Amino acid sequence: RIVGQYYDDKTAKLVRKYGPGPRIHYHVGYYPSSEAPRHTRDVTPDAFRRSIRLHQEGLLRYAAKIWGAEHRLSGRILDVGCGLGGGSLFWAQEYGADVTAVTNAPEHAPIVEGFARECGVGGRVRTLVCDAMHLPLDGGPYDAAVAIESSGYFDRPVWFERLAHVLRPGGSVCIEEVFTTRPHGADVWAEYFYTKPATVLDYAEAAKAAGFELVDDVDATSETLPFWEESTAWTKAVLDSDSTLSAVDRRQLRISLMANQALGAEWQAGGLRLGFLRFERK
Amino acid sequence: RIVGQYYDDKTAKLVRKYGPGPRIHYHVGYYPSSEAPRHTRDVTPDAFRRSIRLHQEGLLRYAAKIWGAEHRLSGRILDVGCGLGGGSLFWAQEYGADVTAVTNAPEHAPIVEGFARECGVGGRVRTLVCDAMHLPLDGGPYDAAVAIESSGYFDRPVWFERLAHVLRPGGSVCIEEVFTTRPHGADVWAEYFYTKPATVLDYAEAAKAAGFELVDDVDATSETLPFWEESTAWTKAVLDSDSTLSAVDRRQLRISLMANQALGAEWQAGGLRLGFLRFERK
Amino acid sequence: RIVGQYYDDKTAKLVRKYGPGPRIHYHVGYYPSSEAPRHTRDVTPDAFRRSIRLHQEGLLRYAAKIWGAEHRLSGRILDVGCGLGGGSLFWAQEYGADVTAVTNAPEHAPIVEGFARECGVGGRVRTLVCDAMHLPLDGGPYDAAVAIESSGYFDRPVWFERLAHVLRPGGSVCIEEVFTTRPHGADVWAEYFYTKPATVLDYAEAAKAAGFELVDDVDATSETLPFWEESTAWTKAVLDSDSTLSAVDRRQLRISLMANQALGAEWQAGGLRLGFLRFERK
Amino acid sequence: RIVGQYYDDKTAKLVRKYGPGPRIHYHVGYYPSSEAPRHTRDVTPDAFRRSIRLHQEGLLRYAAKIWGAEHRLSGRILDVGCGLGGGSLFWAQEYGADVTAVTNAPEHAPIVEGFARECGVGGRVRTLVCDAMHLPLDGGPYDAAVAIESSGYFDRPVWFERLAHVLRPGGSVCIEEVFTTRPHGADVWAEYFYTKPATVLDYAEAAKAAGFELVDDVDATSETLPFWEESTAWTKAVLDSDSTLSAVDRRQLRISLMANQALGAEWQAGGLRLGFLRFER
Amino acid sequence: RIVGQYYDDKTAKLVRKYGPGPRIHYHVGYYPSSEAPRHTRDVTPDAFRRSIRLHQEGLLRYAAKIWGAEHRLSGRILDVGCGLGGGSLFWAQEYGADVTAVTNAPEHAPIVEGFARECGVGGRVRTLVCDAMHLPLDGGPYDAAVAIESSGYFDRPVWFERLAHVLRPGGSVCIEEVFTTRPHGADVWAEYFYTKPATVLDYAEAAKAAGFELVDDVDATSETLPFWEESTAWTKAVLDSDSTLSAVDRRQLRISLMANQALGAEWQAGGLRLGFLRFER
Amino acid sequence: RIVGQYYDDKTAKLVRKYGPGPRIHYHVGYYPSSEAPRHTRDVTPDAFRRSIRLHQEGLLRYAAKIWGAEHRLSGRILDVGCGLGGGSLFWAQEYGADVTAVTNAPEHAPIVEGFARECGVGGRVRTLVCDAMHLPLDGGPYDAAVAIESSGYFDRPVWFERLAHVLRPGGSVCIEEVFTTRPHGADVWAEYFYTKPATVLDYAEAAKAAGFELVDDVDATSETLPFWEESTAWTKAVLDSDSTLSAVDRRQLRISLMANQALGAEWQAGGLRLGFLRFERK
Ligand SMILES: Nc1ncnc2c1ncn2[C@@H]1O[C@H](CSCC[C@H](N)C(=O)O)[C@@H](O)[C@H]1O
Ligand SMILES: Nc1ncnc2c1ncn2[C@@H]1O[C@H](CSCC[C@H](N)C(=O)O)[C@@H](O)[C@H]1O
Ligand SMILES: Nc1ncnc2c1ncn2[C@@H]1O[C@H](CSCC[C@H](N)C(=O)O)[C@@H](O)[C@H]1O
Ligand SMILES: Nc1ncnc2c1ncn2[C@@H]1O[C@H](CSCC[C@H](N)C(=O)O)[C@@H](O)[C@H]1O
Ligand SMILES: Nc1ncnc2c1ncn2[C@@H]1O[C@H](CSCC[C@H](N)C(=O)O)[C@@H](O)[C@H]1O
Ligand SMILES: Nc1ncnc2c1ncn2[C@@H]1O[C@H](CSCC[C@H](N)C(=O)O)[C@@H](O)[C@H]1O
Numbered sequence A, B, C, F: 001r002i003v004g005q006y007y008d009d010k011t012a013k014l015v016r017k018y019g020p021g022p023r024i025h026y027h028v029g030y031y032p033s034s035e036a037p038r039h040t041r042d043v044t045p046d047a048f049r050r051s052i053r054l055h056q057e058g059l060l061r062y063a064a065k066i067w068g069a070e071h072r073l074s075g076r077i078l079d080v081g082c083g084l085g086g087g088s089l090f091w092a093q094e095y096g097a098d099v100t101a102v103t104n105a106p107e108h109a110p111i112v113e114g115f116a117r118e119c120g121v122g123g124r125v126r127t128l129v130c131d132a133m134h135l136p137l138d139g140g141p142y143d144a145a146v147a148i149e150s151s152g153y154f155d156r157p158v159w160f161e162r163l164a165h166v167l168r169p170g171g172s173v174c175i176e177e178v179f180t181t182r183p184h185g186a187d188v189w190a191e192y193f194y195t196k197p198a199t200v201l202d203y204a205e206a207a208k209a210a211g212f213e214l215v216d217d218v219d220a221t222s223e224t225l226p227f228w229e230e231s232t233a234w235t236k237a238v239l240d241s242d243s244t245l246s247a248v249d250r251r252q253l254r255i256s257l258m259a260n261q262a263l264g265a266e267w268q269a270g271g272l273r274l275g276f277l278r279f280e281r282k
Numbered sequence D, E: 001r002i003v004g005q006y007y008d009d010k011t012a013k014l015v016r017k018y019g020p021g022p023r024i025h026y027h028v029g030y031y032p033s034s035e036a037p038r039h040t041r042d043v044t045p046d047a048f049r050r051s052i053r054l055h056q057e058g059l060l061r062y063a064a065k066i067w068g069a070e071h072r073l074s075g076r077i078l079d080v081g082c083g084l085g086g087g088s089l090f091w092a093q094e095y096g097a098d099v100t101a102v103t104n105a106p107e108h109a110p111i112v113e114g115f116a117r118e119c120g121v122g123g124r125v126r127t128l129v130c131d132a133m134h135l136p137l138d139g140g141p142y143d144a145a146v147a148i149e150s151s152g153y154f155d156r157p158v159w160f161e162r163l164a165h166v167l168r169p170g171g172s173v174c175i176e177e178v179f180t181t182r183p184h185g186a187d188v189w190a191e192y193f194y195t196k197p198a199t200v201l202d203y204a205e206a207a208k209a210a211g212f213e214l215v216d217d218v219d220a221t222s223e224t225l226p227f228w229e230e231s232t233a234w235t236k237a238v239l240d241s242d243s244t245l246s247a248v249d250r251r252q253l254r255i256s257l258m259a260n261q262a263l264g265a266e267w268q269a270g271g272l273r274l275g276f277l278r279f280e281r
Helices: A003-009 A011-018 A045-066 A086-094 A106-119 A156-166 A187-193 A200-209 A226-241 A247-268 B002-009 B011-017 B045-067 B086-095 B108-118 B156-166 B187-193 B200-210 B226-241 B247-268 C002-009 C011-017 C045-067 C086-095 C108-118 C156-166 C187-193 C200-210 C226-241 C247-268 D002-009 D011-018 D045-067 D086-095 D108-118 D156-166 D187-193 D200-209 D221-241 D247-268 E002-009 E011-018 E045-067 E086-095 E108-118 E156-166 E187-193 E200-209 E221-241 E247-268 F003-009 F011-018 F045-066 F086-094 F106-119 F156-166 F187-193 F200-209 F226-241 F247-268
Strands: A076-080 A098-103 A125-129 A142-148 A167-180 A212-219 A272-281 B076-080 B098-103 B125-129 B142-148 B167-180 B212-219 B272-281 C076-080 C098-103 C125-129 C142-148 C167-180 C212-219 C272-281 D076-080 D098-103 D125-129 D142-148 D167-180 D213-219 D272-280 E076-080 E098-103 E125-129 E142-148 E167-180 E213-219 E272-280 F076-080 F098-103 F125-129 F142-148 F167-180 F212-219 F272-281
Touching: A003 A011, A003 A106, A011 A045, A011 A106, A045 A086, A045 A142, A045 A167, A045 A226, A045 A272, A076 A086, A086 A098, A086 A106, A086 A125, A086 A142, A098 A106, A106 A125, A156 A167, A156 A200, A156 A212, A156 A272, A167 A200, A187 A247, A200 A212, A200 A272, A200 B200, A212 B200, A226 A247, A247 A272, B002 B011, B045 B086, B045 B142, B045 B167, B045 B212, B045 B226, B045 B272, B076 B086, B086 B098, B086 B108, B086 B125, B086 B142, B098 B108, B108 B125, B156 B167, B156 B200, B156 B212, B156 B272, B167 B200, B187 B247, B187 C247, B200 B212, B200 B272, B226 B247, B247 B272, B247 C187, B247 C247, C002 C011, C045 C086, C045 C142, C045 C167, C045 C212, C045 C226, C045 C272, C076 C086, C086 C098, C086 C108, C086 C125, C086 C142, C098 C108, C108 C125, C156 C167, C156 C200, C156 C212, C156 C272, C167 C200, C187 C247, C200 C212, C200 C272, C200 F200, C200 F212, C226 C247, C247 C272, D002 D011, D011 D045, D045 D086, D045 D142, D045 D167, D045 D213, D045 D221, D045 D272, D076 D086, D086 D098, D086 D108, D086 D125, D086 D142, D098 D108, D108 D125, D142 D156, D156 D167, D156 D200, D167 D200, D187 D247, D200 D213, D200 D272, D221 D247, D221 D272, D247 D272, E002 E011, E011 E045, E045 E086, E045 E142, E045 E167, E045 E213, E045 E221, E045 E272, E076 E086, E086 E098, E086 E108, E086 E125, E086 E142, E098 E108, E108 E125, E142 E156, E156 E167, E156 E200, E167 E200, E187 E247, E200 E213, E200 E272, E221 E247, E221 E272, E247 E272, F003 F011, F003 F106, F011 F045, F011 F106, F045 F086, F045 F142, F045 F167, F045 F226, F045 F272, F076 F086, F086 F098, F086 F106, F086 F125, F086 F142, F098 F106, F106 F125, F156 F167, F156 F200, F156 F212, F156 F272, F167 F200, F187 F247, F200 F212, F200 F272, F226 F247, F247 F272
Parallel strands: A076 A098, A076 A142, A098 A125, A142 A167, B076 B098, B076 B142, B098 B125, B142 B167, C076 C098, C076 C142, C098 C125, C142 C167, D076 D098, D076 D142, D098 D125, D142 D167, E076 E098, E076 E142, E098 E125, E142 E167, F076 F098, F076 F142, F098 F125, F142 F167
Antiparallel strands: A167 A272, A212 A272, B167 B272, B212 B272, C167 C272, C212 C272, D167 D272, D213 D272, E167 E272, E213 E272, F167 F272, F212 F272
């Protein structure tokens, strides 16, 4: 949709906040203690940035553990909604996977190829720019598909049909996602990020219809709540310190801070769930 | 029922361990800090008994909070799988509910009424020896059903259907239960307690087919883990201190001790969720 | 006897787990390398059953070696606490002994004679339902008594006195047993098996007061530890593979699994010795 | 200075609260689960003092764990700001260390010595009534120096210079202290106890300039916050229980309660950090 | 030399014993409990080959554990004396490494390449038909070099010199080998397999003179002694089972049995050590 | 007896073999794996010496663990049969004990005071030269007594009476010792070292008579067997390498080697037991 233009235009802010390096993640970070680190020695934007980065990697490491990526994500896999390729390179390098990276933000694909060349995995990571519900996917059967915080953009009934045609029997669909637990329980997240979160039931119903079984359903809501404290704290540090900010840039950072507070309030209100689902194709 | 007789044989040990009347609870306790109490001066059996009982009440006090017991559990309710009446009297005394307590252990029904009479609520607490998913009940339409750690013995598709007919529109089904998060994630729990734990997804599927919306899905695994520490230390204390135990009782307590360690381990292993659900009748 | 009835109720599970006749053993197996067998290709229940049985025979073959069974256990012997006859037939068949097998489980006496008859040794193996430390036995003086993992149920001061009268000068008492090495070092063993383990010192004191010299005190704790690995893996295999198990049997097997881990832990903790003793009558 | 006299004056009000032991401790307690014990039906002053003393002892056990006192704190050590000798005796008895206990409260020195004898380690524990930033180096090189809640009273640069000359190479300097995490973050603590708390960076800079390497930094703010609830409860239990309290001591106790209430609020406000540090020479 | 031709000749007798996989291994097996599996009622040649292949694979899993192949063996590495490529493929597949596989048996090079494709790592595994002590350094610096049972064929000083120029600083050199523990301790092994086994000290001296630091030394003699019992059993199972064996191959098999019997006796005589070593540049 | 003159005269050989340093032990070493280390890089006498020394320290560390020396051996204790003070300094320094070191070899006491001064524990370690069964012991009640491989020289009935007068109630007697398990089962050890080993029963009988209870009985026979391989190997290395040996010194080393082989053969023949006993005064 317009979401590809919305993801295009914030390329600059993502590299500012979640860069640099070759692996830039754009998803919430995982704090296995449900507590944000205390930042004392160093309260500059770069301190929160590196802490956000490290715990965003912690999210991937945690997922590969509970999903047993050693055998389930080491083969030929789809990285649906790849962002800037942080996840894509993570599977390619940590588990040797051959990755097809999918995005509807064209500005992003060349960045992912750059970063893959960079780490030397350009022969095992490929991008393609299309909608993930209409994608023609040459590349034979894939052993798995991973969606880190992108399935909220998808039509789930139709998306799971798509994956049923391109995933071999017994292949996995691994989803990290914001879900509702009550109705409207993720509205702040939904309206601000142009997503349409549903319940875990909705995902399971749509996946069952296309021939997938739910084999794992993990609640990481409490372990990802600290991400909003760090995300907020970073935004405050930039506003507080950098005096080269134009009035326009300063207002976007302000709007980002205002949103991070309302998102963090929602996260703990009990109406949403940060989940890790894994489906197996029947 | 084999398990109905299993519950009858438990009464004496249930009464000794979960303390005297009038409210005797047979569920896990709720430790809001996810820390076990440090019993530093007094490590007697009665000291762990009291702490276990205090937090078993806390479970109910907590559940009353998240479920809005003041309007949702203050009317004509079903208390399904009622144990020795602890939850029955709680709802009847703390929220004025008219409680119909259901159980398949005949030995327990007179116990509960003898305790309801003692508390001056004998006219608003009656029992029904019963299979939860079978009887007609001519108690007119019901405002709510509560099931605290009993629904694991039930055929959830059939049980929700029963409830659909006896519950009024918008009436609630409130569940505290051990669910699986992946297949086999509660095998110790299942085989030791004759229980058939299922995933929260299955509960939602079964309740939907019967006409119920899931409107709340709270986690409390880490807040109930300290209960296994406390229950293990009670059993250790009794084995260490009580020298008037028959070899038969001592063996049961040694067995209970082994079970409590396996259960506490399983609580931590990730395959298991202690959650609170609330459904609403369409 | 409460424990006599406990042994009667065990027969079916004893027969299933410790393999079919004619020699059915109910003691720990003896692994001379203190290593458990690596079952690399076949991890079926029957594969662990066979290995357990092979090493249960090895226990007897080992004990025959260290005890000089050729001259010491080839005559008129008592086999006290005889189980299902495994040891009885071993001594009768491998060393030509005339065996009087003693037990307090009435269900087991016909089992043993049906197996002695099948092996053509029915005239040199008779049973005696009995308390070990009570009956008169008019089997004339005896050359030896053997007690393989049964003496833990006995009053050792009284039991050695009985034996002193029915044994001839220089006759041997051969014991394999779980002893304590410090108080409480075998509490799991004791409470789960209704047993009263004592230190080797107590056995020596009791046997001295009755007229017996201790002439051999062998350790075999580390050589019998692998048995708990094997017994645990058998139980795991049955739970994993056998889908026709009643909830009752499944629960017993889940309980046995928990017990086997606690026992294997206790075997390693230092409070416990699996030893072989030989006494000689003065 | 006036501080050494300030410690002299509160000797009796401090043996009442934290005594009698032979080990009296004057530092916060360590609650490993980060919550105070629920106190049963005994809510008397002695019930709370016993709990306070318990977790005070636990703080030293925990410091001894993370510092590996087995090797690092079992030799010839300085106990810098020994209070009433509770920490000094601890190292002497639990780790077979020889301890030189430094204080600027001359009244406390006899009390530490008397208690060293009654424990039978008087031949392993001597006192030094002096300023910590002017330590007699006659007495040979020391293995380590430990400062439990005393270093907020020190000129850190100067103190670490003194330590650089009395401590062998590789010697450890083990510190438990209230640090700041931001400016004015420990002002209630500072202005009430006459300390100058500084950040962890300040401490590492001063240690560096004297040849010391920061090798360990543990945050124990959460685990010591309940001390203020037990310390507040004890005070309330005293005002509530004994009606044979003079108006003057009843007002001193009251002021301590208001202080404990202000101190515990600042402990959770974010601006402060109860930390454990170790430097190597 | 004559060795490279000696490896060429035994290609068929070695695919028979240790194939077919796509991973064929030519090193002893690792039996972590130090005893061979009791073989049931299936005592056929394939039953033993499967067991031999199992613990051969386990040796590489165990080496990967103690070497931490996650970081050290997951980059651009040399597989020095790659045999039929079983170890090469292992590092490519299990640790996402890029592998240059060196051998002096030219017949083995196609077999390693063919198997690299069939596993889909042919773009991560190239071969080098050359002498290990004359390695082409064009091909950029390597992260590590691994030598599973090949270094007994090497001039260690010269080989480590070559390694010092092709390996980045901090690069690892991971060796599994038969070492001597005393003079003549591996003579059966040496004279049968055309090797010159040396002690661990010899290896560390030669590595040092080329700038390498010995950082790990594990003794696995006990855990690899059962390989000779399984290897002997397999041979017996073949002589016993198939009566359509030519006299010539029946005599070659017989000689291998006498060899395995002499080799396993020397493995327990004390004079030899199956070891795992790691050097850092 | 003459044993003090026998212990005097081998002062030279003990320092040669088990020195130097301040802690020289003269007891068997403890190898927790029951396997002697493989010595390959370095097979000189000094390699075996240091390995013997290290595992002799391992014996003390193991004993303080199973005896909980932190509270049981940190007080005022008797080190009966102190040798050259290795054990004495170990308790004084590792657990802060105040040690009275007893010996009948006067040449040895000044060596122990030297080594105590040396380590700075001269104020907490004192020697006295007398027979351990007639010793006047001023020094109030002692909290414990330790005997590492010396009680074989003592009259056990009489020695335990002595300890009953000087040990406070609840104090420990900690014995490491060679014991017989069969008669004559330690004859090689006994005749060569002028000891009179008895059974564990004999020790318990004598200790019970003077008011002690046996609370711990550990079998370390298998863990100390490797000591004879190292002790032999050292003796061979000295004979093999050192060419400055006189014919007399070379014959004593030969005689020592011949004895170490016969002692090592006895150790595994099953007739002796290397034990760690702990008695508590009633
Ligand atoms: N309809 C659609 N089809 C394909 N990709 C879409 C899409 N809508 C949104 N996306 C992509 O989904 C991603 C959401 S955030 C990126 C997630 C990334 N895997 C990470 O965690 O690092 C963006 O890359 C966005 O471009
Ligand atoms: N099939 C069935 N039908 C109705 N009740 C059942 C049942 N199977 C088990 N139960 C009941 O469910 C309860 C299990 S635990 C007791 C729960 C109680 N609400 C408490 O927390 O104190 C017992 O009352 C048991 O008798
Ligand atoms: N009081 C008693 N008198 C006689 N036998 C007893 C007894 N108590 C228990 N036993 C027996 O002791 C045995 C325990 S285990 C079975 C042991 C058997 N020798 C074997 O190893 O196969 C059982 O036969 C049990 O019936
Ligand atoms: N300038 C100074 N020189 C030496 N000691 C000082 C000092 N200023 C304060 N102190 C001492 O440092 C201690 C602070 S509080 C006491 C801490 C003690 N280790 C305990 O935990 O119990 C007091 O003994 C105080 O007298
Ligand atoms: N001089 C030399 N240069 C390079 N490779 C050599 C060599 N001499 C022997 N080799 C090779 O080293 C290997 C020895 S055995 C094969 C080892 C292999 N890593 C495996 O475990 O399967 C053979 O491939 C042999 O051809
Ligand atoms: N009758 C006796 N009275 C006191 N000591 C004796 C004795 N007979 C032998 N000893 C002493 O007992 C010791 C035996 S060996 C020394 C053991 C020492 N604790 C160690 O393990 O390091 C010698 O010191 C010897 O002199």
